[PDB]
């Protein structure tokens, strides 16, 4: 499954995850690709906070669904 992680700067990141994947594991995937630690990561999907311990299928992320990644210190 393909998802889009759109940074605030506009750059779009594509990830291969499964709907059973944890948000924590997803945050690790963004951390791998361009180095933002999961602590500084805060994903927003459908205008909603993504709680850290829950899987994507809980929020119903499908293929090519887009997540917004906003960084806070």
């Amino acid at each position: 499954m393909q998802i889009f992680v759109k940074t605030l700067t506009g750059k779009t990141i594509t990830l291969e995850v499964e709907p059973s994947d944890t948000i924590e594991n997803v945050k690790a995937k963004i951390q791998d690709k361009e180095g933002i630690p999961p602590d500084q990561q805060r994903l927003i999907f459908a205008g909603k906070q993504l709680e850290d311990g829950r899987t994507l299928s809980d929020y119903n992320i499908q293929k090519e669904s887009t997540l917004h990644l906003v960084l806070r210190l």
């Binding site: 906070q49 709680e51 829950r54 809980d58």
Partner: protein, 96 residues
């Protein structure tokens, strides 16, 4: 726990007919999470337009507040209304 609380409100909205027994004027003292302003609003709405037309305003106002399910369950069984109180917990605690 901003999600298990979030579903539990969707549970209450879906199974709302079970909550008709809840009398708003007799439950508000048991909900400290509600701010002083909302207690005035709910009591006035309960006075203006009956009881069961206020219930949906009560829950839709509870679910803003932090840690409401923990309070609401205690309030629900504190109002001698226990058959429904354990139902709400069994939806909340089941989904941590």
């Amino acid at each position: 726990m901003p999600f298990a609380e979030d579903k539990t409100y969707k549970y209450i909205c879906r199974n709302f007919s079970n909550f008709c027994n809840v009398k708003v004027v007799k439950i508000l003292p048991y909900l400290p999470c509600l701010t002083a302003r909302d207690q005035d609003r709910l009591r006035a709405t309960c006075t203006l337009s009956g009881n069961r037309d206020t219930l949906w305003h009560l829950f839709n106002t509870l679910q803003r507040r932090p840690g409401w399910v923990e309070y609401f369950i205690a309030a629900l069984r504190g109002c001698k209304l226990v058959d429904l109180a354990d139902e709400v917990a069994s939806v909340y605690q089941s989904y941590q």
